[PDB]
Symmetry: C7
Subunit: 278 residues, 7 copies
């Protein structure tokens, strides 16, 4: 049992998309920010030295807030979406690997004892019965899926509001005279200043909105545990004479058991003997 | 069975070309962009300080959209083309390795039992019969090939339209007076400004168009599963007395079985004994 | 016994959050500081060369102290929060792995001897009795949890005081004439100067305050050792005929024993036989 | 059989030279381009600010094409020359390792059976006979060699044409007035501008031409499969009583078999007994 | 005996604190020095070009010495504190691992022989007696601890003197006219110049002083070898019938033996049988 | 036979010196070139802007050739000196490891058979006889040594000519008026310009000349194969009753056999019994 | 015999100090040189543009030689001090590991044969006798120690002469008019120019002089082979009835044998039985 999966293929694909997409998007944004140098460009008057114009540029930059906090918010979303599979790996993944290995070894040994009893002449059902009123593995799994859905939906709201905000007149006017400089007339009353990275942020927001809308049906589908395709694996094993709608973790354990019947070597033989019996 | 392939050689070659080519092309483009510094150069008038001319350059840059979004689009195509083999690896690759190992071990054991029965004096056919009305492995495989073909064809359309666009007069005129600056006559009415990286983007688009046109016949050929060269491997094994035009996954499993008969040690002996029998 | 955990899942999750969050926050802050170059911008008068204005900027920068020492304080908090699990790993983690391996091997051997005695026809209780008046493992564990709680609470106080400080008028006035320059009138009496990174530090402080408030209930809960859910594992083993409110390390060892009963192969069989007996 | 080669020594040496030489040449060129900063230097008139002269320099740079596209073409040649051994490794290398291991194990077992039959008192010939009318391994091998020869010859043509082009008057004149600037007389009619990296590109082209001319006889020699030195290995094995001019893959398999007779332990003994028999 | 420690937990913790703290402190200082660029800022007069002002800045910088040599001194302290555990690892650590493995194997074999003699019906004391008048392992251990204490105390003196020095008027005046420039009156008699990194060096000195004062009691405690808690391990083993105030290395070997009785499997059984006997 | 050397110690030392010395020398040169920025400094007249002076500097730089192509030539020498051990490793090293392992196993088995025949009561000579008229391993070895000697001698000629060239008046005059600029008198007739990295290149050439002269006697000595100290190993083995001036590869194989008689365990016993017999 | 040392602890410590100290010193020097940018600062007159002053700075820099070649000389010393342990590892270290393993296995087998002969009722001396007139291992060892001592003493001479040189008036005057510029009076006759990195080089020379003086007594002590503490190991083994002032390699082999008697398991038993016999 080297290759025991312990994660649904759909869930594994969803997590990678939801985490590895904002990481490459902010890697692109940060590379663009180190090529372009600055994120704003103001039109300082002609009688300004370099340092005064740099003051005007950094003053009108540090004075909406959505645009300036774009890569920090996307990296926060990437980290908060990496968090649930860390929670599942530390809390419920080692308590499931031993149960899967026990049920698989039990099924193999029952098949071999039945073959040795046929050619020379119920523990797993009672152990599945124990996992019928526990609600211990379905809770953590639901928490992992609901936290992923909430973070994805909130990031989708923010990336929709960003396109609804910076769709026109991205430039803005800015005042300089705050404090001591409120007396001299050498300084202009209003400078015209342009945000210079908002052109690529709408592309990086449309991509991260379209993919995040295409993800969410799979999270909603993965939260519906007992309405999936279940109970195909024991019907194969009822050939041996020695041998699902509620949300307890018997359903989830049956999903994790049908997900890897590759390790069961007896399953192929019993599927063949089922195909003869039809 | 250490070296079990689980990927067709043509498919493995196609994926690497379609993914590793835009990565090196945008690595070249990004290295060029950090050497040249900027992507535009405007002709500001003589009475402009450095900061005003920098404002003119970054204003006429952030004001078609195809040219400015070239490396982001090519990296998006590279990531979206890496996505299908991730889908195949997580979803259908471990369900195929166990089937290949079962059929190979079954064939070796049948050969050894027949040799021990000849020198001292049908499970695989019924298991291939089970994979005759399933349509489970051909669906995911077709999805992986159709998604690759669609992304390659859309990138080919975009890279054809880019050469059909920026083929002449890459420079353009640009206005500065938007907003407060619409009154003074010290600013020029129109500045002449040049896009400076469009010379190498036509080379990086001709290469990425020619290779992407040469790829697509192999994807179209790989989507034709039952019209390939099949059913050469059981005709070798019919020497032992104990022992394809539709799109079910028996055809695909036979392709994946003829692709690695290197691991079958009995295959060489039976091919030799076939060559004696001709 | 390859996968012996030696750390509670809650404690492992808390440490990673409390350490890996300030590291990414100051990585963002340092990347922002190398893009923006400087952390202050003063308005030097027009008759100043570059070097005199740079002197004004670096003089008014090196002349509150909370703002200038933000990333050093957050990295100090990250290192001081990595320190307790280093203390636990070097001091008390190898003295616990051998005890866990001894009790697990003892339980497996007692189960096998009882099965061989039933089918062919108290050392662990006395060893748990030895760990009843020691107070050796609960002390180091409490020190690890109290040090984590104190560092998290002090960082929460500092990050609350930072938002209570830099909430308005982040710019400030600064005098230049100290020393020889206290005579000439060419220098201005007061320059207006702006702190330019205080806009993103309030975001990086609100995030690091909200997460650090959400952590602390789990540290308070983990410090309550005998009020957790204990003593579920020996009640399974009382089926064999051969076989908690105070703060000694019998309680902590029982927590570390119920945390990994995955390695006990006899536990599943005895749980099944308990389910038959109910 | 750990050290099974599956590549001819000459072919392995040729590929490394043809791939690792343009990589170090363009690594040198890129390091030179980041030290020197720019690739052109124009002589702007005295009344030009920095930004106007930078516009003149980047305008006359982005306005032959051979010189500007030198490192991209050399990296394309390096990647296209790495491609054929990837094709050989994915497509025909695992189908050859099993055949080599089968023939080597068969020869060792025949030698041991003959020694046990002499001291106590034809499968490989029929398997070599099967690989006599196949043409399956010679095709892929020829494609790998012809693609390498074509890419090397085209790169040699380009690097010969580059020295035949930029051998004299590397500087050039350039016009600035295109578009709006075609009216004022303040701009000069023609600027004199110099290409500054063409001095080292002739060295990097003479090296990459001389080595690529010295490679090509070995590729032409490696394409002549049946005219090499063959059939020395079975004449050693005809001592045991139990036991080439056309382009089928029996010749190529004999080349790959004489290339590693180090793994055959019986070969040394039979060579010694041949030396006694002469 | 894979996990044999050969280092006291307190000593291992102390070394990491004393070495890994100045490394991160000077990593912060060097990152700050590459962001700020320079370490001094002088006020050059208005008639100075850039190069003359740069000369003034680098002249008044290269003309106390404590401040300029801060990161080199802290890295020297970090390297000199890494040196003693290298000395202990190369010189006395392999001569101790074999002795620990011999005594542990001897104790296990004596326990097993006594159990086989009880159920079917003094070498270690004489080997501990040999290590009673040697003084070979206590010398190197004392040298490692005294060198660590001396380096920590000298670094504490230097970091106390640095705060006692740069506590007020960090700026200073500087003369320029040395040599040929001692005649013209265009140069000023004294420039006012500011040290710009002394604000963060007092923080990096207060941290590195407080932690280094908190370390030193543990080094003083670790140098007191025979006044620790010893001789608890043979009193467990006196149950079998076949079986400390001076500074010889019997005391140190007993410390290193009580530090890992986790590897002794007989120790748990004998501790249980001691608990029955009380 | 894990530690089989397959390279003479002298040859291994020579290759590392001849390859790793120019790599560190050009690493130093490249680090110096990125600190100093440029490799030339011209004295442009006072009425030149920055861009015109930069044109003068890059024009007089790109207009002897020995100095400008120094690091490319030294890296070419380093790569061409790494090439021969790659040739030896791919072509003749696996054909020698099997022969060494055969002769060593044969000698061990003959010693054990002779000891079992003495205590209870010629294949290697005939295999050394086979390697007496082959000339197959001495050819490749000679090619590896002659190519190393030729590259080292040519690099020594070039590094001698460089010191014979740039020993005095490293500065030079340079003309600017080529082409359109040959009419105006505002440009100077000749500028004085200095090569600024020639001071450290004479140090990096004296080091790389002295070490390369000290290497060459060892290459000349290694090319003299039959005049080394040979035939000491069979005289030890003539104790058992069952058991060099020309340039065939029997001499080279005897050198490679006396180079590792550490793996022969029988050699020590037979050397002892030889010392008794003297 | 996994942990066979093959290097004296003193020698291993000395090599690391002598090699890893100049590497960190020049890493500090290079980091300082990339922060400060340049290594000289000249006082150009006021009528000089940037490029003319840069010419003055790079001209007076490239016109003593000790100061400019400091990091290259220290890296040369570090590489030349890494060279002797490479020589010892390639040439004499594998010829010693086999001898140590032979003598250790011989001693263990003699002890076991004597114990089996006592409880049931001279090869190593003659092999030590063979290594009594060889002088083969003492020569290479002496060469490794004398080369280390010579390089350390020459670096100590150079670092003493550097402090004896740059102890006062580190600034210097420099003339500019060489060549064409020897006629105009606009250029000054002498500029005053300052070396700006000589302040930290005296610290990096005092450290590297004090440590290199403290090393040299250990190299002088390690060169005295027969005057060390020898011949303690055979006096332990004379208990079994079946069983140094000159510079042959019997003395050196006895040093390398007493250095690792940890691998001899019989040594502890025989030391115990010696302690009984006293
Ligand atoms: C409010 C206090 C409730 C504490 C509930 C609790 O910790 O249950 C524990 C739940 O176990 C866990 O995995 C807790 C996970 C803590 C992760 C911290 C997440 C911080 C949230 C902010 C980031 C978004 C049961 O463990 P046990 O007591 O050792 O058995
Ligand atoms: C002068 C020619 C004398 C050659 C002596 C010689 O190479 O003896 C050989 C010595 O073996 C060695 O390790 C030679 C080491 C060469 C290292 C090259 C050092 C270059 C010196 C400059 C760097 C300071 C014996 O080897 P064999 O002949 O294979 O048995």
């Amino acid at each position: 049992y080297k290759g025991l999966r312990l994660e649904l293929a759909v869930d594994k694909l969803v997590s990678c998309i939801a985490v590895g997409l904002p990481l490459l998007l902010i890697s692109l944004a940060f590379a663009q920010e180190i090529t372009l140098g600055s994120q704003i460009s103001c039109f300082a008057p002609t009688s300004f030295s370099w340092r005064q114009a740099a003051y005007v540029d950094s003053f009108c930059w540090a004075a909406l807030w959505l645009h300036k906090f774009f890569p920090y918010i996307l990296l926060l979303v990437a980290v908060l979406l990496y968090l649930p599979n860390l929670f599942w790996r530390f809390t419920a993944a080692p308590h499931l690997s031993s149960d899967l290995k026990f049920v698989m070894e039990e099924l193999d040994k029952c098949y071999n004892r039945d073959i040795k009893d046929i050619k020379a002449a119920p523990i797993v059902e009672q152990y599945l019965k124990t996992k019928n009123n526990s609600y211990g593995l379905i809770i953590k799994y639901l928490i992992c899926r609901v936290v992923t859905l909430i973070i994805v939906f909130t990031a989708c709201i923010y990336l929709g509001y960003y396109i609804s905000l910076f769709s026109l007149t991205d430039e803005f006017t800015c005042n300089i005279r705050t404090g001591i400089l409120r007396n001299d007339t050498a300084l202009p009353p209003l400078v015209q200043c342009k945000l210079i990275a908002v052109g690529v942020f709408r592309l990086l927001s449309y991509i991260n909105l379209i993919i995040y809308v295409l993800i969410m049906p799979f999270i909603i589908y993965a939260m519906l545990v007992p309405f999936r395709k279940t109970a195909n694996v024991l019907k194969v094993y009822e050939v041996l004479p020695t041998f699902s709608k509620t949300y307890d973790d018997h359903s989830l354990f049956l999903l994790f058991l049908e997900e890897n019947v590759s390790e069961l070597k007896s399953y192929k033989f019993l599927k063949v003997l089922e195909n003869i019996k039809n």
